[PDB]
Amino acid sequence: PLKYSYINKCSRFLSDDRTEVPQLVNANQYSPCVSIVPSTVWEDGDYYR
Amino acid sequence: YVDVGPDSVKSACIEVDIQQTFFDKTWPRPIDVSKADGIIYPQGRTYSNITITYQGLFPYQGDHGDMYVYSAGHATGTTPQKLFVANYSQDVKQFANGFVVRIGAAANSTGTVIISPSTSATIRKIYPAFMLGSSVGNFSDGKMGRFFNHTLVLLPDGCGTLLRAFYCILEPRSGNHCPAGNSYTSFATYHTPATDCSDGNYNRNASLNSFKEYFNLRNCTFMYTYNITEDEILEWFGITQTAQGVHLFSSRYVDLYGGNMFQFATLPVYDTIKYYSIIPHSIRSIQSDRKAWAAFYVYKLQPLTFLLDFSVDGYIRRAIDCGFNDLSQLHCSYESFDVESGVYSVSSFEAKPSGSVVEQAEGVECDFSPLLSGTPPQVYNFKRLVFTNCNYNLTKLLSLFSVNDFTCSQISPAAIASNCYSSLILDYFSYPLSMKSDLSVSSAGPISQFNYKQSFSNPTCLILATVPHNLTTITKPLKYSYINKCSRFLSDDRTEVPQLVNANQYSPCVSIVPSTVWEDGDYYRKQLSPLEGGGWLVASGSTVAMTEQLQMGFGITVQYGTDTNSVCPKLEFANDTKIASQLGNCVEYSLYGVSGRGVFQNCTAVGVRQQRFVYDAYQNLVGYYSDDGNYYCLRACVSVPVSVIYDKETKTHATLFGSVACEHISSTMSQYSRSTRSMLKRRDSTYGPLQTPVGCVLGLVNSSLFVEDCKLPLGQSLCALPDTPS
Numbered sequence: 001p002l003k004y005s006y007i008n009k010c011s012r013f014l015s016d017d018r019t020e021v022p023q024l025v026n027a028n029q030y031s032p033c034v035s036i037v038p039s040t041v042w043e044d045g046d047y048y049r
Numbered sequence: 050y051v052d053v054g055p056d057s058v059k060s061a062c063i064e065v066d067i068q069q070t071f072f073d074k075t076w077p078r079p080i081d082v083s084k085a086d087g088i089i090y091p092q093g094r095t096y097s098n099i100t101i102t103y104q105g106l107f108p109y110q111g112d113h114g115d116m117y118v119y120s121a122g123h124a125t126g127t128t129p130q131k132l133f134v135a136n137y138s139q140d141v142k143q144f145a146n147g148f149v150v151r152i153g154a155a156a157n158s159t160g161t162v163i164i165s166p167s168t169s170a171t172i173r174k175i176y177p178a179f180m181l182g183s184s185v186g187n188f189s190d191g192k193m194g195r196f197f198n199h200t201l202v203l204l205p206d207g208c209g210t211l212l213r214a215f216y217c218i219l220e221p222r223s224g225n226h227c228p229a230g231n232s233y234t235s236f237a238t239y240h241t242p243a244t245d246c247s248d249g250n251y252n253r254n255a256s257l258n259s260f261k262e263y264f265n266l267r268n269c270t271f272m273y274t275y276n277i278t279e280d281e282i283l284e285w286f287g288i289t290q291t292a293q294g295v296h297l298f299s300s301r302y303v304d305l306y307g308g309n310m311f312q313f314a315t316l317p318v319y320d321t322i323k324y325y326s327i328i329p330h331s332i333r334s335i336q337s338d339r340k341a342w343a344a345f346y347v348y349k350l351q352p353l354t355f356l357l358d359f360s361v362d363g364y365i366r367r368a369i370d371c372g373f374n375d376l377s378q379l380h381c382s383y384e385s386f387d388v389e390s391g392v393y394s395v396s397s398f399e400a401k402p403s404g405s406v407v408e409q410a411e412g413v414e415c416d417f418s419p420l421l422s423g424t425p426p427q428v429y430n431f432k433r434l435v436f437t438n439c440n441y442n443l444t445k446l447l448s449l450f451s452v453n454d455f456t457c458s459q460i461s462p463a464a465i466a467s468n469c470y471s472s473l474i475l476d477y478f479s480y481p482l483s484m485k486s487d488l489s490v491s492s493a494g495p496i497s498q499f500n501y502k503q504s505f506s507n508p509t510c511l512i513l514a515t516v517p518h519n520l521t522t523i524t525k526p527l528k529y530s531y532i533n534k535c536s537r538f539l540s541d542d543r544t545e546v547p548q549l550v551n552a553n554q555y556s557p558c559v560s561i562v563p564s565t566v567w568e569d570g571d572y573y574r575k576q577l578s579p580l581e582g583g584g585w586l587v588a589s590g591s592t593v594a595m596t597e598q599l600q601m602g603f604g605i606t607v608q609y610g611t612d613t614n615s616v617c618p619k620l621e622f623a624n625d626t627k628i629a630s631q632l633g634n635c636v637e638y639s640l641y642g643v644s645g646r647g648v649f650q651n652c653t654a655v656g657v658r659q660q661r662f663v664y665d666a667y668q669n670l671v672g673y674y675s676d677d678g679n680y681y682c683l684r685a686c687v688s689v690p691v692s693v694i695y696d697k698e699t700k701t702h703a704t705l706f707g708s709v710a711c712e713h714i715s716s717t718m719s720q721y722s723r724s725t726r727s728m729l730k731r732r733d734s735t736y737g738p739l740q741t742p743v744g745c746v747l748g749l750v751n752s753s754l755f756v757e758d759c760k761l762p763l764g765q766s767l768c769a770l771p772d773t774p775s
């Protein structure tokens with residue numbers, strides 16, 4: 001790999017802009033956040049929405 | 050990737066006319082669980098004629114299902130015309146641990162054409178097509194049900210003797226009446242019997258090719274096909290998903306007559322299915338040659354348990370949904386299809402919960418009142434109020450001024466009012482509207498340069514507003530003023546260094562400038578001490594004439610706590626139901642973090658007053674002192690015991706609700722203890738509840754007979770006679 005990478009956060013913001021919902025990965029399932037994250041993380045601490 | 054073969058050449062498609070009102074029919078098909086309808090055979094094991102309980106995914110016994118009907122497209126004369134179809138393409142459904150379907154149940158019977166139902170054509174079995182996947186969304190025309198990434202496709206091809214499965218990315222087509230086109234209506238597929246399904250040459254690719262006309266296949270990663278032969282007999286099919294991937298089940302491979310499902314096939318795809326839909330299809334047959342099609346049904350799987358009556362030949366012949374009604378529960382408790390007659394206990398009604406009641410301290414108030422009196426400061430002299438741990442309504446605060454500028458950075462102006470923060474800070478000053486072009490955190494104006502600045506480390510806002518004629522305690526400066534210069538001369542008396550104002554801070558030059566600037570262009574200087582490195586402070590200012598109503602500006606900043614966000618826009622039931630109390634039923638509650646569900650009632654006052662929570666020796670809350678100064682008592686809530694009378698000889702039943710009495714009894718129940726009460730209704734649809742000394746009953750009948758032993762006594766002098774023998 002160009003760099004080894006991982007997702008160190010996965011949550012969804014609540015529509016009211018005051019709270020946030022965490023999303024731990026389910027056993028034997030891809031995290032939902034994979035739909036936005038790039039095939040590699042371009043820089044450490046990158047975040048996406 | 051998979052060798053699917055070439056994309057069809059035309060980008061063009063047949064237009065799809067939606068005729069969905071023609072498909073409204075009422076032909077429900079509830080599951081006959083006693084016939085083992087829809088039962089999936091257990092995995093990897095078989096049994097003797099012994100009855101066993103079992104747990105697995107199954108349909109509810111009472112579900113009538115979802116019904117769909119395929120039909121011929123429009124045709125006239127001797128040729129095909131634009132399609133007439135059901136709007137089923139819009140039926141996005143949430144996937145829910147699989148489903149099963151019923152196919153061909155209407156075989157060897159007649160019905161109507163539906164799209165042209167006056168023909169009353171006989172009906173024949175047709176195989177359904179489906180799409181499954183992890184996401185759905187709008188078509189470029191805003192149409193429902195477009196799918197993303199890769200999806201499952203199940204399509205029969207040509208005649209039902211061939212079946213294919215796919216995992217690919219669909220690609221839209223820009224041709225007329227196709228998905229990237231703006232002439233698109235709805236996706237559909239079709240079969241053309243004129244050449245399709247020739248007796249010596251069935252068209253194995255027929256359905257797929259008509260599918261290709263609306264979507265180009267892309268990146269197919271899986272394809273499968275299956276060998277099927279014609280048989281008008283009813284068949285069962287279904288889908289489940291596991292960490293081992295998707296599995297397919299059918300009754301056709303093993304049990305053509307009993308209908309038990311078996312796992313016919315499995316699929317490598319383990320990608321989670323989040324959505325489900327039926328793919329529409331139509332027949333291109335000649336108008337006089339149109340044929341009506343058999344009804345088609347769908348049912349949903351659930352994590353239920355059942356009695357299973359295995360036959361000695363290992364087929365399941367009968368089953369009991371344990372949760373369907375009280376009697377079914379009784380059968381499950383004895384693992385049998387024949388419980389001995391008696392009176393039996395059944396689970397109690399859990400009652401019903403009402404809307405919540407909560408009491409918590411209130412009256413926070415954010416001390417914002419200083420803004421309403423005296424003369425506001427010149428913009429370089431702005432006054433600040435810091436607020437933490439407190440309750441506010443900034444939209445109420447801002448209704449005290451007419452706002453001529455409501456803007457913010459890194460927060461919408463509406464959101465900062467509704468957002469909770471660890472702190473709320475407000476700056477205020479007089480400010481003429483004539484200077485409004487110069488008030489931004491990004492402004493080129495002298496106000497941002499020397500008078501007021503806000504940090505970009507926090508969301509901030511700027512407000513311009515003016516004073517109402519009814520705020521008479523507010524007064525105004527002789528002239529509006531600002532500093533238009535602030536620099537220090539370097540000690541060599543030639544070099545000079547500008548001093549732009551620091552974010553969230555007064556300019557250093559405020560120390561030399563007067564509380565207002567007496568005239569436009571006034572300037573001042575101060576010698577600086579050797580500790581300062583020498584030099585001179587220099588500053589100047591400018592003014593704007595006073596106005597009939599005071600004009601003002603404000604600054605707002607906030608800090609969001611990670612978990613310290615104690616400042617919030619709490620309201621004391623403004624725009625709300627006022628749920629501080631109910632008297633009463635059984636609605637959950639919270640009292641200063643104490644919580645439970647129960648009924649409150651107004652009662653006397655026990656001591657010690659102001660200890661708030663009265664408790665018994667078992668720590669049940671007994672009652673509570675409200676902040677309205679009244680004691681209320683709490684009885685939590687109560688439930689209704691139930692029992693049933695079972696007459697095994699006649700296989701009939703009746704029920705008793707015990708001590709609850711018939712004043713709380715109704716033909717249906719809102720509480721509820723089980724998924725249905727309809728078994729009682731089988732005869733009790735025609736009768737009112739009867740009160741007895743023990744309690745209210747259903748379907749008891751008042752015979753006023755005297756009998757020694759009824760073999761079903763209810764206790765007391767009550768007795769329960771069986772219907773007379775055949």
Ligand SMILES: *[C@@H]1O[C@H](CO)[C@@H](O[C@@H]2O[C@H](CO)[C@@H](O)[C@H](O)[C@H]2NC(C)=O)[C@H](O)[C@H]1NC(C)=O
Nearest residue numbers: 096097098099100358359360361362363386387
């Ligand atoms: C299968 O269940 C049947 C239930 O009928 C059992 O057959 C009964 O056996 C008892 C005593 O062995 C007889 O009194 C009944 O008359 C039988 N029933 C019938 C309908 O004849 C049987 O034992 C079970 N096992 C097998 C292998 O058949």
Ligand SMILES: *[C@@H]1O[C@H](CO)[C@@H](O[C@@H]2O[C@H](CO)[C@@H](O)[C@H](O)[C@H]2NC(C)=O)[C@H](O)[C@H]1NC(C)=O
Nearest residue numbers: 153155156157158174279280281282283305306
């Ligand atoms: C209508 O559908 C099929 C087709 O005729 C019938 O299924 C047959 O049932 C008999 C019963 O023993 C089987 O032996 C045949 O193999 C079945 N298939 C055929 C003839 O293709 C079904 O029973 C019919 N429905 C009725 C008569 O109500």
Ligand SMILES: *[C@@H]1O[C@H](CO)[C@@H](O[C@@H]2O[C@H](CO)[C@@H](O)[C@H](O)[C@H]2NC(C)=O)[C@H](O)[C@H]1NC(C)=O
Nearest residue numbers: 210211250251252253254273274275276277278
């Ligand atoms: C079972 O499936 C196989 C292939 O999976 C079938 O074999 C081919 O089927 C096509 C059907 O369009 C025919 O055109 C070919 O001539 C068949 N080839 C061979 C070598 O048989 C097969 O016909 C299916 N049915 C049975 C009963 O085996």
Ligand SMILES: *[C@@H]1O[C@H](CO)[C@@H](O)[C@H](O)[C@H]1NC(C)=O
Nearest residue numbers: 069070071072073135136137
């Ligand atoms: C078409 O689908 C809609 C779903 O919104 C449904 O209301 C309507 O009854 C359908 N037409 C039928 C089933 O004939």
Ligand SMILES: *[C@@H]1O[C@H](CO)[C@@H](O)[C@H](O)[C@H]1NC(C)=O
Nearest residue numbers: 035184186196197198199218
């Ligand atoms: C899956 O679909 C989403 C929908 O927006 C898209 O953004 C994403 O690129 C797709 N992923 C693929 C094709 O791998």
Ligand SMILES: *[C@@H]1O[C@H](CO)[C@@H](O)[C@H](O)[C@H]1NC(C)=O
Nearest residue numbers: 050218220266267268269270
């Ligand atoms: C999907 O299809 C595109 C066609 O443009 C191809 O380039 C790509 O390699 C395919 N496979 C993926 C994204 O895994």
Ligand SMILES: *[C@@H]1O[C@H](CO)[C@@H](O)[C@H](O)[C@H]1NC(C)=O
Nearest residue numbers: 651652653654678679680681
């Ligand atoms: C609630 O209790 C108090 C004290 O017992 C008494 O005024 C009355 O019963 C209730 N108050 C009402 C209904 O205003």
Ligand SMILES: *[C@@H]1O[C@H](CO)[C@@H](O)[C@H](O)[C@H]1NC(C)=O
Nearest residue numbers: 738739740741750751752753
């Ligand atoms: C049942 O019959 C008895 C006969 O003595 C009568 O007194 C009683 O009121 C009846 N009750 C109901 C609920 O019909």
